[PDB]
């Protein structure tokens, strides 16, 4: 029991840490997707503004 309880506190702690890693990694998948979309949007806008600048050119 102590071995299963301890194996568990460790599987569970490793899990909280892996889940945290996933949470933080996911927080970053999301922060990266926000930056990617902000930058892709600025890029598409740079390209819209470029197409416009080129049209205005």
């Amino acid at each position: 029991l102590d071995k299963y309880s301890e194996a568990l506190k460790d599987a569970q702690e490793k899990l909280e840490l892996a889940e945290k890693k996933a949470t933080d990694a996911e927080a970053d998948v999301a922060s990266l997707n926000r930056r990617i979309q902000l930058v892709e949007e600025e890029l598409d806008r740079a390209q819209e503004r470029l197409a416009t600048a080129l049209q205005k050119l």
Partner: protein
């Protein structure tokens, strides 16, 4: 037994009381919000036996006790039983006498005023606490979760308050209070287990169904498809060992119970579910707030521990939300314990040390002071 005069925190829900001292990351002990009383005639002489049992005593001797909850849908009505629970909690098990420590209690912002007033009165008059502070669950949940901004949907045992906060500010016009909570989900389960041949009608039986629910139930991200197979095969059933050697298995009842969160009509409530109330709390906030609340949907309270709840709630809001917006759920392991943890955080913040009612102001004003000094 503590070596510092820290504040005490006691999260007195309609279910269980989580308590410990301020500054920690967990309650030191958890007691049920129960005072138990014998429903039988004593036969033997010299057996001891109490007129009433408190907290864990009430559950330990429950075989012949009727177990009552002093708090109904979040509000204390039986203050005498509350005082018994608090005395046991603070003096016998947590080993903190309130006389030497300031105390923080918790409650929904729309919890009727008698709750915050009576809790304040008892800690000052029967416990002689040097100071008091009744905190709000939405505040406590955002502190526990590491947020200043978000929707707190506390799917606890009593009442769900659904309260949006932005940059630390309440957005009260967007609060959607719902008369649906974990206690009702348990009651629904008892009726559907009766349909399957397992009738639970007495206190011992009720406490057992709650324990079964906590270990066996899940939300399902597609109720109808999950039910189509749960109702057709034993392959989706899970067993539980009853205390008397009997066993029970649960099939679609396993998910129909938490489904009431998405379908309150299951218990007779006129509501579209916790995801519509969450959605409306985001939607009813100003247009420049909405984007931040969609991305910071905070699950709190108990029932947040049903598998799949953190994901189904993101799906249900995403389905109602405008495109472009990011919808995201916050659901840490500090779930169900988040209100207590928020209490610990808040009680010990330097920014909160001016929020405490001292036992000076209290006697000059009386317990109604809580409505001016706390919330």
């Amino acid at each position: 037994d503590e070596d510092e005069t820290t504040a005490l925190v006691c999260d007195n829900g309609s279910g269980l009381v989580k308590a410990g001292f301020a500054g920690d990351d967990a309650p030191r002990a958890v007691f049920p919000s129960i005072v138990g009383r014998p429903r039988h005639q004593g036969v033997m002489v010299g057996m001891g036996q109490k007129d009433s049992y408190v907290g864990d005593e009430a559950q330990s001797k429950r075989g012949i006790l009727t177990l009552k909850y002093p708090i109904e849908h979040g509000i204390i009505t039986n203050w005498d039983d509350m005082e018994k629970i608090w005395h046991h909690t603070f003096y016998n098990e947590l080993r903190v006498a309130p006389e030497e420590h300031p105390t923080l209690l918790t409650e929904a912002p729309l919890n009727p005023k008698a709750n915050r007033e009576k809790m304040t009165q008892i800690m000052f008059e029967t416990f002689n606490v040097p100071a008091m502070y009744v905190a709000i669950q939405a505040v406590l949940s955002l502190y526990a979760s590491g947020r200043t901004t978000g929707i707190v949907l506390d799917s606890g045992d009593g009442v769900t308050h659904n309260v949006p906060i932005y940059e630390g500010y309440a957005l009260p016009h967007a609060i959607m209070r719902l008369d649906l909570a974990g206690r009702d989900l348990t009651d629904y389960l008892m009726k559907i287990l009766t349909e399957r041949g397992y009738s639970f009608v007495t206190t011992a039986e009720r406490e057992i169904v709650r324990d079964i629910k906590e270990k066996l139930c899940y939300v399902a991200l597609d109720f109808e498809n999950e039910m189509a197979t749960a109702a057709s095969s034993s392959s989706l059933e899970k067993s539980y060992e009853l205390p008397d050697g009997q066993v029970i298995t649960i099939g679609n009842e396993r998910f129909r119970c938490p489904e009431t969160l998405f379908q309150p009509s299951f218990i007779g409530m006129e509501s579209a579910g916790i995801h519509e109330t969450t959605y409306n709390s985001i939607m009813k906030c100003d247009i420049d707030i909405r984007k931040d609340l969609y991305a910071n949907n905070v699950m709190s309270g108990g029932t947040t521990m049903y598998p799949g709840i953190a994901d189904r709630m993101q799906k249900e809001i995403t389905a109602l939300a405008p495109s472009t917006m990011k919808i995201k759920i916050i659901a840490p392991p500090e779930r169900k314990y988040s209100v207590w943890i928020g209490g610990s955080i808040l009680a010990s913040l330097s920014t909160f040390q001016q929020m405490w009612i001292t036992k000076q102001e209290y006697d000059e004003a009386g317990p109604s002071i809580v409505h001016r000094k706390c919330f």
